[PDB]
Design a protein around this ligand. Sequence first.
Ligand code: ATP
Lengths: 617, 1081, 67
Amino acid sequence: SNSGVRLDGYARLVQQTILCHQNPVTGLLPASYDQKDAWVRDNVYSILAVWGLGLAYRKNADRDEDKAKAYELEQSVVKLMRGLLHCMIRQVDKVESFKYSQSTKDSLHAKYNTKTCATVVGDDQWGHLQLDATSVYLLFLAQMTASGLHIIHSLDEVNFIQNLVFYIEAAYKTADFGIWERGDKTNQGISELNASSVGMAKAALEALDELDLFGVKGGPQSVIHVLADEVQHCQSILNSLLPRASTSKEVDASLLSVVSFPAFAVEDSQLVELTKQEIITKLQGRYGCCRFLRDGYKTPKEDPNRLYYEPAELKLFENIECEWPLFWTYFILDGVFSGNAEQVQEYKEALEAVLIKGKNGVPLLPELYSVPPDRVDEEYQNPHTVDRVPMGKLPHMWGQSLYILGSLMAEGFLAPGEIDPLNRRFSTVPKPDVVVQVSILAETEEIKTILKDKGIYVETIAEVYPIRVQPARILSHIYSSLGCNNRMKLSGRPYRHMGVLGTSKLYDIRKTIFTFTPQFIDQQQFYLALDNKMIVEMLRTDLSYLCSRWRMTGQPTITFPISHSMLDEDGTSLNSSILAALRKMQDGYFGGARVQTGKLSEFLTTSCCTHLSFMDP
Amino acid sequence: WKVLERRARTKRSGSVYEPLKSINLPRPDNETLWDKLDHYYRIVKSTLLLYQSPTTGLFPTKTCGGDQKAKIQDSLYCAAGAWALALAYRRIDDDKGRTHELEHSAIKCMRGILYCYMRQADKVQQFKQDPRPTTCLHSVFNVHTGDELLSYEEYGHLQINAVSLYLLYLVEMISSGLQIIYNTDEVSFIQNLVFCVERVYRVPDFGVWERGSKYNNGSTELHSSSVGLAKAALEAINGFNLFGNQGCSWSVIFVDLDAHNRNRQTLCSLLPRESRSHNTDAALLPCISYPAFALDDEVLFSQTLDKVVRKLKGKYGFKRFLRDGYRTSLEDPNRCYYKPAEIKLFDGIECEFPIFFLYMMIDGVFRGNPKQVQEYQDLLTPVLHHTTEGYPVVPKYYYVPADFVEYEKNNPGSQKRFPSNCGRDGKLFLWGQALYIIAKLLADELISPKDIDPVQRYVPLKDQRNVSMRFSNQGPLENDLVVHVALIAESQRLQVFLNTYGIQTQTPQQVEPIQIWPQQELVKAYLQLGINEKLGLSGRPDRPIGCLGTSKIYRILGKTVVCYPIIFDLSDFYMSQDVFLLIDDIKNALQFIKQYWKMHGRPLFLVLIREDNIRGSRFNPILDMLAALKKGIIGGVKVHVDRLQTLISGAVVEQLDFLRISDTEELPEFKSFEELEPPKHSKVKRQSSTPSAPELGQQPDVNISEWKDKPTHEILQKLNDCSCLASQAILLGILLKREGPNFITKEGTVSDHIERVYRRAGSQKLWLAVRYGAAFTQKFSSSIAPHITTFLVHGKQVTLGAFGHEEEVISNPLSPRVIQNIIYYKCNTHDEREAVIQQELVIHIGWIISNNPELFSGMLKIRIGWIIHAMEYELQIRGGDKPALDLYQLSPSEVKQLLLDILQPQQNGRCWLNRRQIDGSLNRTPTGFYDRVWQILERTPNGIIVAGKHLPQQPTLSDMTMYEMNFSLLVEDTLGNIDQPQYRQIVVELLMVVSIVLERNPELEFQDKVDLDRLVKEAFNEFQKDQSRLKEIEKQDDMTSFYNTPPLGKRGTCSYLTKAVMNLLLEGEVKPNNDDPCLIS
Amino acid sequence: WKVLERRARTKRSGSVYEPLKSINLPRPDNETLWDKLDHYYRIVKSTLLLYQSPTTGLFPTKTCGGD
Ligand SMILES: Nc1ncnc2c1ncn2[C@@H]1O[C@H](COP(=O)(O)OP(=O)(O)OP(=O)(O)O)[C@@H](O)[C@H]1O
C-alpha cells in the first residue's frame, strides 16, 4: 500500500535523524553538536515526532511487523520519559526546599547530563529556573497517559508528581529565566515574569485535574488533585499580560507556543488573532521569524566568547537579528490543527525553500540564519534585503521533530484528536452561562425564627446531620497533608489561603459530605468582616467572580451562615443591607449572577463533589 | 527404587557418591514395547482395518451378508481408535512404516465422511432456513459408492449428534496435528455446518438410537445428549484454525456467543433427565465422558452418574433406558411402530450393552480413579469372546432366551443371557472393538490423556480457571465481573449540557479513529462471510445479534468497530417512549452480561444518549441513572467509566478477514454513526427541563358498541368537529374496519391520520389512545419471538388468548409470522387491546424470567389472560370502595410494577378469598404435587373424573413413570378445564388431602372412580349446615363464604375435605396388611 | 459434597431430579478471599515494599544504619 510505503519512509527519516542518538542505558538524547548535555524541553519536544509516528503505526494493527514497530516506538518514548523522570527524582531535596521560599538558587537544574544521570553544572554557573520545561513535561506526560501509555509505575512516583505540581503551581508570582534562559534583553543576572511560563503552568494544571496515572486499572488512591484558584489566577495574569511579550519585551515569537497547538493555553480568539498578526508584522522574515527585538544571539560582533552584555545595544543588534524556521513550523502546526488549509500550504511552500539537504538527501532544518559580517550596513539601510547563511546546529532535533509532526498531520496519516485526547482544541469555545446556587443557614433558633417572621425559610446548623459546616481553615489544614510521605522527606502542600472557587465545591471525606463556608466571613482573622456594607459588597464581587469563569465541572454551591455579630443594636432583627441582599437573592438576581435559593439536600442531587482518598485511615 | 538401586555398599555400610541414573533400575516383566504394540497392531488389522472400503474409507456396520448401509458414528469411532493407535505407535522412531498407515486411515475415514456430507449442499442450505426432518442431512450412506440408501419415510435421518461428534473429532485431530482440510470451499462448508448446528436448541432430533422416544411411535423430542455434544463442539471450534500450523488469519472459523449461551441454558436445566419421556438413558454417558466433557459443574455430573449407575447398571452391561424393546424376546419383528400399553411387556428383559463397561473404564482412567478401572476391567473379563486366533470380541448386546423370560421377570438377574449375533467369530462390532482398543491402550498407559485431548476437553477441578467461553478468571464459584461503560453524546450541545451537570460525555466527532456501528451493519458483514458460488451458499442467516455479540470489538478493513446494544434503537412500538422502561432494560442487559460472560477481557458496554429522551420531566431519571453509572455500581453490578480511546487501547480485538478475501468487485459500504448537526431554524440548545402542565383530562364518550351502525357522513362530521384523541382513534378504527384504510378523509388518508394521532398521543403521553391506535393498526414487536423462544427454552409452556375463552398453546418455537397470526386471529370477538396487553405481558415476563427465574418456580404453564384477570382483580381490590381506574392507561411502568407485586411469593393480609383467587390465576401449585397425583392414581383404580375430563389409570401406568414430565403435562391439561380459579384451588387442596390420607393410611383404598365435583358439593353442604346451625343463617347458594375460610384451625376447609374423603374411603373394602403386627384392627 | 448437598428428601426418601449447582455446597470458615489478600498486602507493604529505592528500585540488604 502507498500509505505503508509513506509510513516506512517516515520511519526511516526519523530513525536516521532523531532516533540515531537514542543514547541507551538512560534514553536522553544529546542536545545536538558536541555538547554532551541533555535539555528536558529539547528532549520532550523531540520525542513528539516519535510518539506521533508510533500512534500512526498503532492504527495499522493485525501484523507482526507493524505491531513490533509500534511497540518499539512506544517503549522508546516510555524509556525516554522514565529517564527524564529519574533525572527529576534526583533532586527531591531541591524540589522540597523550593516548595518553601521561592528562590533561583533552589530550583532543579535545567541542564542535565548524559548517561549515569548526574549534574553537569553547579547552582551558580547557569540559570536553573525554567518552569516552562517542567510544565510542558507534565502536560505531555498527562497527554500520553490519557492516550494509553504507562509511565508512572509506583505510588512514590505519584507522591513526587504531586509535590512537583505543588512546586510548579506558584509560577504566577515568581520570576524565572524564561525559555531563552537569559531573562530580559540584557542578561545582567536578572529574571522576570514570562507569559509562556505561566501559560504552560496553567495548561499543565488544567490537563492534570483528575486524570489517573495508572490508567483504567488504577484506583482512587492514584489520582492527583489540583486547586482551581491557581488556574484562574494564571489565566487572569495571562489575560492582563498579553498585549506584548513581557514587562520589558514588546513582542516575542515564543508566544506562538501558548496560543497554538502546544498546550492551547489561551482564550478570546480575537486576542489570539491580534497576537498572531503582531508577531507576523514585527518578526516575520525571509528565513523564518526572529526571537524578539534587540537580541544578540550568534552575531559577528559583541565578543561571542563573553556573557553579561553591557547596555551598549543602541543599534548594534537592531535590524540584523537572526530568524528561526521553528516558528514557521509552529505556524504550520497551528494552521493545520484548528481549521486552516491554505495557510498550511503556503507556509509549507515557504519552508521548503529554507531547508538544507543532508546525507543521502535527507531534509535538515538549520538552527538559524545569520547575516554575513560584510553585508551588515546594507541590512541596516535596507531591512530584509541581504542573504543570510545557515549557522548553528544543523541537525536541530527540535525544529526537525516539529516539522516531521506537522508533515505527518498534514498528510492525513494522523488526526488532531490523537495527539490531544484531552480535547484542548475547543478551549476557545465561548461559555454560554453558569447558574450558581446559594444556601442560607441559621446559626441559632432565634435567627431562624426572625428570618421566618420576615418571610424567609431557612434551616439551622442542626437538622442537617449528614452534612457538616466548618470554616475553610479546616480544609486548608487538611489539604496541607496532601502528598505527604516520610520516606522521601516530603512535607506536602504548604499551608495557604483558600479562595472561593473551591470552597463552593463539595467535598466527601470518610463517606461524609463536607460543606465549608467561604473564608471571607472569618472575623477572627481580620476585622473587615465586621462591617455590613463591606461584607455585602465583597460578597457581590465574589459572586460575580464565581459566575464569570467557573471553569470546573458541575454546579456550584455557596453556604452563607448568619452570625450574631450582624444584628441590629437591639439584637432583634437583621440589618437593612443583609436583608436587602437576601431579598435580592430570593428574586434570583444579585450583581451580575443568577442564583436560585434552596436547600442543601436539593443541591446535593446535582453539584461538584470531590472525594479525598488520602484521608482514609 | 531409591536405596535398593545403589547396592554399592562394598564394605559394610557408608555414604556413596557416584552416578546412578535410572536405566539401571529394576525393570518390569521382560517385554519390549515393540512387542505389545505389534500385538495391538495385529489385533487392529485383523478386526477393524480389515473392513474398510478403499473407494470412500467408510467402515461398514455389518461385516457379512454384503450389506451396503454404513453409519457415521461407527466410522467416527473407528477413526478415533485408529488415531489412538497411531498416537501409541508414535512413541517409537523405528515404526517400520505403520504410524503413517494409521494416520492415513483416520484421514481417509474423515475425508469419506466429509465427501458424503458435501455431496448434499442443497440439503444444508435448506436446513439452514427451516430445519425439519424432511430437509435434514442423511445419516446413512452406501458403503461402496457413498450414495443415499434409506429415504425419509423409513429412517428420518434427523441426527445432529453425528455432525457434532464429527466436528469435535475433526477439531481434536487438527489440534493434535493432521492434514484433513485442503481447500477453502471445505472451510466454507465447515462454516455452514457450524451454522446448521448453531440452531440445535430448537429443532428436536431422533436421538442416538434413531427410535425417537421410549414409545417408538415416530415422534421426535429434544435430547440432552445431542445438545451437550453440539455445545461441546461449539466450544471446541471457537476460533480454531482449520489449516493447522500452516495457516493464516483467513482460515479461521467463527461462532456467535448467543447460540452457545442458549444451548448452555437449555442444557443446564434438562441435564438431570434425558428428555421429556426419558428419566434416565445410557446415551447421556458420552455427553459427560471422554468425547464431549461438556458438563463443567462436577455436581450435576456426579448426580447423573450416580443415577445412571443406580438405574441402568446390569451384570452383562448397561441398559439403554428403562422399558425398551430392541431385539427383545417379546418384540414382534413385523411392525416398525409400537402400540400403547405394549411397552409395559418389555420390563425386566432389557438388553445390556457391554460397551458401557468400557466407557466407564475410560472415564475412570481419564479422571484418575484406578479402583473403578480395575473393577470394570474385572467385570468385563468374563463377558468378552475370542476368535480362532484369540482376538477379543465385544458382543453388541445380550438377550434373555424366550423360554426364560418369565423367570427373568420374576427374579431379575437370576437367569443367564445369550450373546448377540455379533458376539462370535464371523460377525464383528467395529464400534465395540474400537472402543476396546482405545480403553485397553489408555489403561496400559500407552497413551497419556493429554495425547488424545489436545484441545483440553477435560479440565481438573483445580484448573477450571482460564478457559474461553467456559470459565472466568474468578473461577466457577464467584461472579464479580466489572463491565466497562463508555458514554456517547448525540451532539456537542448535548455534551455541553451534560458537562454542566457534572457528567462527562464524548461525541462521535471526538473518536474519529474509532467508528461506531449499529447492529444492521454487523449483521450484513456477517452475512457476507459464508459465500461460495461453486456449491451455493447463503452464509449466516439474517438474524439479530444479542448483548454478548455486541460487547466485543471488531477490526473491519483496518478500522476499529464498536456496536451499541440493540436496546438503544426503536422501530415502531411505544415501549421505548418511557425512560423508566429504558433504564430497566439497561439494568437487565447489564445483569445478563455480568451473569453470562465467560470470555477473556472486560466486556464493552456502550451508552447512547438522545435529545428526545431527556426533554420534559424525564430528565431527572436519566440524570439519576447517569450519576449511578458514574458512581461505580448500578443495579448491583460494578461498572467503570473512562475514555473510549483509553478503553480500546491494550484490549483484545476481533478480526474479520473474510471481507478481504471476498471476490466482489465493489466492496460494500457500511454507514457508521454520525453526529447530528444543530438545527438552523429553532436552535434549541438543550434548554431546562420545564415540566409545565399543557395537558387535560377527559374520558372518551365514544364506544364501539353504539357508534357502529351510524352512516358515513355523521361519523365523518363527528370526527371533524371533535377534539378527543381517544374518540378520534376509535372513529378512525371503525372507519378502517368498515369503510377502508384507503378512503380519503378531510385530513388525508385514514392510515396517515391514525399514524399521526398515534404519534401525537405518544408524544403527549396518552396511553389509552396510544394502545387503541396500536391495537387497531395491528402493530407487532420484533422482540416477541426471542422472548417466546426463551420461554420455551426454560421448559414453560405458553397459552395465548383472552380469559375464559379460546386459547392457543405453543408447544414448540414458531416463526414470527405464525405467532403474529395466532395473536391477531384468535381474539377477534374481543377488543384488540388484549393483544397489545398480551405482548406487553410476554415481554415483561420474559425479561424477569431471564433475570430472576426463581420468581416463577412451581408453575409449569403460563396463561396470559389469567394473569390479566389477576392484576385486574388486584387493582379492583386496591381501589377499595372507590372503583378501579382502568387497565389500559396505567402505562407499561405501572403494568410491570403491578405484575411484580402480583408475582410475590406471599400476600398475607387481606382475606383468604383474594389469596385463593391470585393463586388460581397464577396457576401455582405446591412442590411435589405431581408426585402425589401419581401416587393417588396408582392407588385409585378406574381413574379420576374432573370437570368432565377423565384420567384413565391403565395406559398412563403402563406407559408413563413417576417422575416423567409427560405425566405433569397430562395432569395440567386435565386440570386446566377448570374455569373458576377458586374451584381449581379447592381441587388442588382436595387432591393434597387425598394424598396425605392415602399415604398415612395405606389400608383403605378407593372402591371405584372418584369424582371431585361430588366431594366439593358434599363439603359445601356440610359447611352450609354447620354455618346454619352455628349462626342461624339460611342456606345460600354459591361458595362466596366457603372460600373465605382458612385452610387450618377451627372448622377449616381441610376438616370438611378430610371428613368427606374418609367417608368415601370407609365405604369401600379395607385390606389388612399382614406385615403390620396390629391385631384386631 | 455429594448426597449431603441435595438434602431435598421432603417425603421419606426418593430420587430428586433437580439441578444442584455448587454455589449451594457447604463452604469453609467465614473469610472471603479479599480479607486474606488485604492481610497479605498489608504484610508485604509493611515489610518488603517499604524498603525500595525510588531512583533504581533496588532493595537494600540492610534496613538500618544507612547502608
Ligand atoms: N429485543 C431483543 N432483546 C434482547 N435480545 C434480543 C432482542 N432481539 C434479539 N435478541 C437476541 O438475538 C437472538 C435472537 O435470535 P433470532 O431472532 O434469530 O431467533 P431465536 O432467538 O433463535 O428464536 P425465534 O425462532 O423465536 O426467533 C437471541 O440472542 C436474542 O437474545
